[PDB]
Design a binder for this molecule. Sequence first.
Ligand SMILES: CC(=O)N[C@H]1[C@H]([C@H](O)[C@H](O)CO)O[C@](O)(C(=O)O)C[C@@H]1O
Length: 485
Amino acid sequence: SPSGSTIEAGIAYPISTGFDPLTSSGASSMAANLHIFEGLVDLHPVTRQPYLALAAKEPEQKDDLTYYISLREGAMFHDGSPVTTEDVVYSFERVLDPAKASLFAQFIPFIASVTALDDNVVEFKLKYPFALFKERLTIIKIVPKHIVEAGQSAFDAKPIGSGPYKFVSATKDDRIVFEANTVYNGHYPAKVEKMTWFLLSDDAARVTAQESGRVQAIESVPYLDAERLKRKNNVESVQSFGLLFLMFNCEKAPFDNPKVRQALHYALDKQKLIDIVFLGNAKAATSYLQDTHPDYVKASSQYDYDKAKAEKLLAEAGITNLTFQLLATDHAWVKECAPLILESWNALSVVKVTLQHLQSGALYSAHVDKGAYEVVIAPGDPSVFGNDLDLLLSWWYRGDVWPKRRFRWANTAEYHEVQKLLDEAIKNPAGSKVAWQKAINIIAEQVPLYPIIHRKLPTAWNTKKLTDFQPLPTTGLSFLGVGRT
Ligand SMILES: CC(=O)N[C@H]1[C@H]([C@H](O)[C@H](O)CO)O[C@](O)(C(=O)O)C[C@@H]1O
């Protein structure tokens, strides 16, 4: 009975993108969209298991290339309109259309066409068989065509979906407000009438909110505060793909030289970062994946701290007096890693580095997407979309979204080989493990964008106030199925 009760939560990530699922890659926007939008099939935020959302029943697989999905009876958008098969077609076609510049088409490269057969059934035709078809549907949220066509920017700021919570408002550095969608008839109806996410990127403010009872759960517990929070709260730390990456503009001298990119990895003392910033709750990367991922295989290139090796590579690359600027995001823990990275690099005999911090939204729109940068450290976690290896590789390495328009490595022979390998692993599934490891090993040698560390992710919540809350293995918070005591 969502009347008389509310949920308040502390979210760690500022709003850095809008909410249009065409482009909403910001951590806090994606988390909101788990509640505002539905796919045809969604993955549970905690268990990652698929469940029927806008699909009325299990997708009917006619053959390896053909699936039919029927819409849940009575499904409605938050404006009171029915969800239609045209809305489904529109949602997939806009992601697939290169002109629309989605951030996510590289997660559905196997879809050939989406067609409305009648007012209930949609036909999906695939380019080749893809066993994870249903699992990927969670990425393509179903949007109301009549709203989006009336103004994409307005929809991006005020999203309308079919999920159990309706968007009320979002105010930067303040809060996102949701309300129960009382016409939702899926599996996870809103258990409270109103939910407020306070945007508390400041570590201390976020912890204080939990301690004071201003919120019932907080994302991304600062490691230093975990012990004191345990007195009155549950604190649980979950193994995660979530990582800190080092990203180079590979078309700007001298970071177009792989030896320079390698050198800067070798120059970093990861154990010091882990001790000082993460309190042991992270591991230096030894592959693309974290070592607890089921598909982890250790990469053939390792970057254990070795200053002499860094110096040797720089001398081979002809570096005698390199001065560059590192851009970093503003996440409190990224701000803590940055000076330590700078100290390690400034200790090199031929490198001097300065630092600039920026909010993530401006970092991408004003610098990265234009190529107006040299080197970035930033956090990333595409495991929000799913946990399969093609997906995690594709986010950063399939197509153009990052390799062409962000880290600018798409003109290399190595990039083209990686594309062939990523395609082979999904078009020839019997060869996938071999093909993925070849791609990962090229990526790990070339280090265009590569993890420095993967981290354990702690969440805190009050079990006396919330029912059925569980922490995620990804960024965000989930209140699907969660109520108040
Ligand atoms: C799926 C994913 O990894 N999203 C990440 C995004 C994107 O890197 C950014 O929006 C550019 O697309 O940035 C963050 O929101 C951020 O830096 O605050 C972290 C988040 O984990």
